[PDB]
Design a protein around this nucleic acid. Structure first.
Lengths: 63, 62
DNA sequence: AAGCACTGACTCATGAAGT
DNA sequence: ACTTCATGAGTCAGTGCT
């Protein structure tokens, strides 16, 4: 039994490791996408409400 | 007996923390930005009620 | 250079969720 | 309690950095 169990775990570790690498790639992209969107919404709000100090209301967060 | 097993054991832990930390970091940044964006979308709605912002800047698929 | 730290991958032992 | 897949950590092999 140990032989096949060992083989199957070798497959699961490969899958787990690839799963973590893709997860990191994914959140790296989403962080950037959300950050750019944040910049777009702050600019649109400024265009529509030229008299509103957005940065003072909803302070920016680092990245 | 005797091996440089100790050094690599430490390096392995370090390499895994670096990655785990990076992942946690991006996750936090992503979550932080998302909440901020939801507050911005609400502010724009309550400031410019008759504006379809989603048709200008659709919500990012988290 | 040439040695030391970094990382990919295999194995072990446990963890977590569904039966 | 059993079965299975997922994962944190030690270890070895190969890589990369200075």
């Amino acid at each position: 039994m140990l032989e096949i169990k060992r083989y199957k775990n070798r497959v699961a570790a490969r899958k787990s490791r690839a799963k973590f690498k893709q997860l990191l790639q994914h959140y790296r992209e989403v962080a950037a996408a959300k950050s750019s969107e944040n910049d777009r919404l702050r600019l649109l709000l400024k265009q529509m409400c030229p008299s509103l100090d957005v940065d003072s209301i909803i302070p920016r967060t680092p990245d």
